[PDB]
Enzyme design. Sequence first.
Site, PDB file in Angstrom:
ATOM      1  CG  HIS A  85      -1.644  -1.107   1.468  1.00 14.14           C
ATOM      2  ND1 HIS A  85      -1.370  -2.237   2.234  1.00 14.14           N
ATOM      3  CD2 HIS A  85      -2.944  -1.640   0.845  1.00 14.14           C
ATOM      4  CE1 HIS A  85      -2.202  -3.354   2.075  1.00 14.14           C
ATOM      5  NE2 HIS A  85      -3.141  -2.923   1.402  1.00 14.14           N
ATOM      6  N   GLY A 128      -7.199  11.818   7.975  1.00 13.38           N
ATOM      7  CA  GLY A 128      -7.893  10.720   7.232  1.00 13.38           C
ATOM      8  C   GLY A 128      -7.870  11.013   5.571  1.00 13.38           C
ATOM      9  NE  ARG A 142      -7.885  18.946   7.405  1.00 16.49           N
ATOM     10  CZ  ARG A 142      -8.834  19.179   8.426  1.00 16.49           C
ATOM     11  NH1 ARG A 142      -8.961  18.596   9.466  1.00 16.49           N
ATOM     12  NH2 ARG A 142      -9.645  20.148   8.115  1.00 16.49           N
ATOM     13  NE  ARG A 145      -4.677  -0.101  -2.085  1.00 14.63           N
ATOM     14  CZ  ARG A 145      -5.994  -0.895  -2.331  1.00 14.63           C
ATOM     15  NH1 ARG A 145      -6.900  -0.378  -2.014  1.00 14.63           N
ATOM     16  NH2 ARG A 145      -5.570  -2.202  -2.684  1.00 14.63           N
ATOM     17  CB  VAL A 189      -3.769  15.958  12.956  1.00 10.38           C
ATOM     18  CG1 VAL A 189      -2.511  15.626  13.765  1.00 10.38           C
ATOM     19  CG2 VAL A 189      -3.474  15.771  11.597  1.00 10.38           C
ATOM     20  N   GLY A 190      -7.300  14.984  13.538  1.00 11.74           N
ATOM     21  CA  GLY A 190      -8.455  14.664  12.864  1.00 11.74           C
ATOM     22  C   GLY A 190      -9.629  15.603  13.113  1.00 11.74           C
ATOM     23  CB  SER A 207     -16.669  18.949  12.467  1.00 14.77           C
ATOM     24  OG  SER A 207     -15.468  18.985  12.051  1.00 14.77           O
ATOM     25  CG  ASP A 208     -20.748  18.021  12.438  1.00 19.56           C
ATOM     26  OD1 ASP A 208     -21.486  18.638  12.039  1.00 19.56           O
ATOM     27  OD2 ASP A 208     -19.702  17.638  11.930  1.00 19.56           O
TER      28      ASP A 208
HETATM   29  N1  LIG Z   1     -20.175  12.650  14.006  1.00 27.40           N
HETATM   30  C1  LIG Z   1     -19.078  11.755  13.711  1.00 27.40           C
HETATM   31  N2  LIG Z   1     -19.107  10.388  13.856  1.00 27.40           N
HETATM   32  C2  LIG Z   1     -18.286   9.864  13.541  1.00 27.40           C
HETATM   33  N3  LIG Z   1     -17.056  10.306  13.002  1.00 27.40           N
HETATM   34  C3  LIG Z   1     -17.057  11.546  12.769  1.00 27.40           C
HETATM   35  N4  LIG Z   1     -16.044  12.384  12.299  1.00 27.40           N
HETATM   36  C4  LIG Z   1     -16.380  13.671  12.280  1.00 27.40           C
HETATM   37  N5  LIG Z   1     -17.415  13.807  12.667  1.00 27.40           N
HETATM   38  C5  LIG Z   1     -18.047  12.528  13.272  1.00 27.40           C
HETATM   39 CL   LIG Z   2      -5.589  -4.341   0.617  1.00 19.72          CL
END
Ligand SMILES: Nc1ncnc2[nH]cnc12
Ligand SMILES: [Cl-]
Lengths: 239, 239, 239, 239, 239, 239
Positions: free
Chosen positions: E8, E24, E28, E47, E92-93, E207-208
């Site tokens: 990979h 992810g 980014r 990939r 870092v997410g 984010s949410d």
């Molecule tokens: N609500 C959510 N559920 C799962 N992964 C996430 N990544 C960002 N927001 C998310």
């Molecule tokens: Cl694979």
Amino acid sequence: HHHMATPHNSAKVGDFAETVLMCGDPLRAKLIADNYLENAKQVNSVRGMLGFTGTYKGKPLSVMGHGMGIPSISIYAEELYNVYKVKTIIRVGTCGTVDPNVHVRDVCIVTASGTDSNVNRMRLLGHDFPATANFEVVSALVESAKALNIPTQVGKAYSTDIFYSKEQGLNEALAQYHFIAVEMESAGLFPIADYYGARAGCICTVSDHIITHESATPEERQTSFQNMIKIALEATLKL
Amino acid sequence: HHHMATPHNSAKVGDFAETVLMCGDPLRAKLIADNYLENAKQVNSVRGMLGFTGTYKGKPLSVMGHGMGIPSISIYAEELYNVYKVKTIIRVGTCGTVDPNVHVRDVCIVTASGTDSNVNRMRLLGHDFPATANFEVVSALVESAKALNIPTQVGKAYSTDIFYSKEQGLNEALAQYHFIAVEMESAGLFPIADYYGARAGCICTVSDHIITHESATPEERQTSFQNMIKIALEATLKL
Amino acid sequence: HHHMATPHNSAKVGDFAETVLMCGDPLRAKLIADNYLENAKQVNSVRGMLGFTGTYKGKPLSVMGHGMGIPSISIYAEELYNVYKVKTIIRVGTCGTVDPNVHVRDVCIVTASGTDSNVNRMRLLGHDFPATANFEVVSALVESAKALNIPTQVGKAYSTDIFYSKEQGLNEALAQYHFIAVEMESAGLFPIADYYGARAGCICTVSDHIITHESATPEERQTSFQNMIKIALEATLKL
Amino acid sequence: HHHMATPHNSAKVGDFAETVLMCGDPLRAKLIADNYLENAKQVNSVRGMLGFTGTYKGKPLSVMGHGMGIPSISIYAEELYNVYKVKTIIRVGTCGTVDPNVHVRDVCIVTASGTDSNVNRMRLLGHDFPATANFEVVSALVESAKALNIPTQVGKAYSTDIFYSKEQGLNEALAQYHFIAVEMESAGLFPIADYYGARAGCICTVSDHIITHESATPEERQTSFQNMIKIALEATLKL
Amino acid sequence: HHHMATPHNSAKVGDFAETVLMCGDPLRAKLIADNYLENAKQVNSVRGMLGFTGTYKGKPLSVMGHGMGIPSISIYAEELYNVYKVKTIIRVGTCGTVDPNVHVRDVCIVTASGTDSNVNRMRLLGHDFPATANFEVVSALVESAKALNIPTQVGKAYSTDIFYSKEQGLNEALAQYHFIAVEMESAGLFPIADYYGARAGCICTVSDHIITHESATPEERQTSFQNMIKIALEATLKL
Amino acid sequence: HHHMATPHNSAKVGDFAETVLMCGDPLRAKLIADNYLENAKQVNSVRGMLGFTGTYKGKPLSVMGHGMGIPSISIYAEELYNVYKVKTIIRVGTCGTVDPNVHVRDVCIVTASGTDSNVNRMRLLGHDFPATANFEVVSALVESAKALNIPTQVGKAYSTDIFYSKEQGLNEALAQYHFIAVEMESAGLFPIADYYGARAGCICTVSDHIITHESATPEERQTSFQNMIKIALEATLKL
Ligand SMILES: Nc1ncnc2[nH]cnc12
Ligand SMILES: [Cl-]
Ligand SMILES: Nc1ncnc2[nH]cnc12
Ligand SMILES: Nc1ncnc2[nH]cnc12
Ligand SMILES: Nc1ncnc2[nH]cnc12
Ligand SMILES: Nc1ncnc2[nH]cnc12
Ligand SMILES: Nc1ncnc2[nH]cnc12
Ligand SMILES: [Cl-]
Ligand SMILES: [Cl-]
Ligand SMILES: [Cl-]
Ligand SMILES: [Cl-]
Ligand SMILES: [Cl-]
């Protein structure tokens, strides 16, 4: 006293054809033999679990009861594949349905079966092992029904250990994912066929709608049975 | 066509006594009725699962087959307790043993039964629910054997879904913890009795030593059966 | 510094009798020794877990605390059976009940115990292993209570890891299946006795009704304790 | 008779400081109080589980035993956070190790704890819920040890229900993933702190190397204890 | 055709720095490289999973995408630690939250992560294995945010396999136990670092809000990202 | 800034055809579009997960990457069925095999897929839910390969969360039960199709024999891909 080739079957090795139909009720196995087999002989009566061997349209075919539930079919099918060297088993059964587009009297051809039993987790290191019908068997059933102009539903069954369910939410989940048949044995059969490099399938008729409470009358169950058994018998000619 | 009080039993409500002996083989149920019951009538033959009602030493008693495995006994026992209003069921069976101090032909009285089935976890929120015999039933069996001068082993059974085990380490663990009997049904019976506020027990004879491979001959199995059935029948008089 | 025969017990090998009563509270073990044993000596005080050895009506008997929960009793009981060569342990405890026909102050004799612990699955390859009391111990307790004219309830306990339950539906399931006692230890004791080829039982008094909220006053708990302990002590004479 | 604020603690509400040290052995709790607390009073002796409240360097601090195993610490900690309104609990314990780079007498500061208990699955819908120490508590312990020039190991613990393990492969897996401490309680403590919006941590000293069989002598355990307790006490000043 | 050091990743052994940031979205990762790394070269594009190596304030640093979910990050991280000899990975997410005191745009530093995946049970004999961040990594992130005067939340994450949850009661349980971040990868990363004796951590921005439905606008997500990435980059200088 | 119809896809509603091919590698999705679709447009590039819509032999068809693992395909497929109103998804992939009669370069058509993921247990109350391909899709693939004179293997796949398996005994069990394909996604796809009343299937080519270590060269993988993709494309004309 007769020699017992297995603890549950007095048939001599070789007394079963390579293709076997099995149903839960041994009395229905006798009806199948009497009404559809030629050259027929009874080969087992241990525990009342009647089994017969003859021919259908000249081709060797056996029919035997399997009793109720995964542990019962597992005993009989393991023995058939291992000791009796059977190559193909088709379960011919009855079922309930929760699916809104499946109706009483419908014929259901099973592609795979879920379960609440542990028997398949125990075979695959605790993981999810799909009890999966052999594709040639499924196809033979589908094509036989088409040639006979009998409509069929094709899809997943669910094999439960508990006829008298008390489980809230089960029917709704089965319906959400379009399980077409609720019965008690097929999920035990398919992995045993796999173990022996052999083939299995299942066809059932809907006796009861679990949601609406619709239920087939005795006459309706006979008509459904006649349709299903003709499909299964014709399918054996292709297998 | 007869009215069906349950989907698996044609007996009329009231046609079963409050006490019932059950064995896996319906042909053995017929033998019990023919050889030990008076005033006897056959009350069921659906699916070949013969059941009979009569008297033993004047007291009402029924005997019926239960088939092989937890799902099969669960159907029949649920119906007996619920529809037929039975109060006491004693399973009368055969078993294997791994215990070094249990021998072929021994009579085993079951106090509780382990299992590899999921049916009891499903009843108790996923937890460990011991399938436990009723104490009065166990005591009646123990005391009847003592009065008859028949030795017994008293202790745990293990009810498996898989007659043809492939599970490494199982026999060693069963022996380490002194499980005396390996069979296929009792762990399904006891929790159903609990649900209905009713009573159950189990007595078995050892047909096979799973470790040493000792096995009872047909004549030895008849002698063991005669001992076990006399114990069970006498116990019913106390229940 | 004294030699430690185990990491949790300073008693010398041989300092425990072959029969031991155990209760959760070490201060209650001291009360039992002071009020019911003769020839008594304290044999352990490690971790405050008081243990004593003497005689009851001339027969050697020990009493020791076990602490709260399956892991605690497992340590102490494993050591007693293995290092101290004990043959019989009777847990003498308190419990709650959900059963509608069991009342505060009732004496409960345990035949088997369910659990939410993993300890028994770990002993039996992940399967259901019923924590089962020895029949001779159960019978000795039942017969001693009868001779003393003290009523008893006989049946299943449930041993939980969580005193402060937050689990919806648990009490209703326990009641549906007629669990008579809710406590925290017996399901850990019985399988250890099995491992060592030894014997165990449990007797408890109901301190609290989990449903109705009835609760025994201090005076009522003393009266219940006096009844239970006399039953247990008399039972040791038969064991 | 004293009023009981909980079933296991006779302390009056308010009799515990907001910060509490807990150890398994109530006799060690007494030693901590006698040797390190001022203004000290005993506030509990129910079940022998001694607890004390005083000050350390002028700041309110309590110390109490928790007994052995997750169910025992769960009772005491739930009560402390809920009824006694405690804000911070630090478990001060002993442990084994399998880690090749951890040695007897080492001080281990726990960041999270695995377990073979079901208690955390039951809190999180059957899923994996990491028993996780509060970061401010971990940091306070690390920084206190640094200021005292006492080396520490920082990392994962494993809390088992079974002191007397019979589980093949467990030690090798714990070593592969660098678990530094094997003990019996911390995995039960951290989720309870979470439930109450409160804080918890754990510090242990290595008494035994599970692989090499190295074991600390009594004098070595006293020296290790003196190092660990000074770290914990100094950490409370930052919390 | 280039030689493939893994199935990979086309990077040559040695082409990754010992410290790696992973996010992810591979796009980014490219943004991070373009805006924050010097001496930068692209080292993988298999990939589309872009990876880059350069320096941050003179210190070697790589950045690479990891894709979505535990199985994806597990592939990439296993390879990085094993083949590429990486010592430290910081994820870092972005994340959601259910916590009432966590708000959109907040920066969350993860101490440990729960999960509904089976991958960690499979590593620890079926038991609870906490996916735990390395303490030095957590501390470096906390201290970098403090020096930058950026507030942070520190605590548990929950890594789910199912972005589109249908699970009743999950959010309420996560909130009850003060899980601060809901994401999909960190619980897979930490145990792999453990296997290799290496280090991992995770920092995310909210984010949410899963409960209130508050959601960050694109501009707000850019501002949150700039805060988080500066914290992570500065933390690498301490690692 | 473009409006986002989902969090992971910038395609406008209606921009996907009712039939979609999906492969793990977005660069392979681009190759499929460039070499086999006409009227083609790129409709997504979020996260580099390239997707395209055009026609194959005049019939609308899309192709998009799905990334690696069940959680990744679950996101993309849920969105396609729910937001984009797709009716049929065929996964076009690569796989390993353990089956002694399956060889590198073979084309495998999947009837059902096992897994070590929890995602399907979570959909069916903890029970066994077989991830089952739609029969019309399987049949279309089988019949297209026959018309093209390309041999195929038909049977079960196993979808694992862990590419880098460390699990002893897994390969032997997969071989015993004749699993033909080992991959990472199909078991997540089929139940999502079920939820939406839609259809799914999977076809893979064998890149590696897990037992013998045989491995396809780059040229061999291109030839295998050309065979598989022609089968899948022709099958779409029947769907
Ligand atoms: N609500 C959510 N559920 C799962 N992964 C996430 N990544 C960002 N927001 C998310
Ligand atoms: Cl694979
Ligand atoms: N409703 C039902 N449940 C289980 N098995 C069945 N077989 C026929 N109908 C059934
Ligand atoms: N060995 C055995 N295993 C399971 N059930 C049995 N019934 C009788 N013998 C048995
Ligand atoms: N209600 C209860 N729950 C658990 N253990 C107990 N012991 C006594 N009462 C109890
Ligand atoms: N080896 C060990 N196992 C479990 N708990 C312990 N506490 C101290 N040493 C221990
Ligand atoms: N060996 C393998 N294991 C898992 N997924 C795969 N995809 C292709 N080859 C694979
Ligand atoms: Cl039925
Ligand atoms: Cl049998
Ligand atoms: Cl208690
Ligand atoms: Cl200990
Ligand atoms: Cl996402």
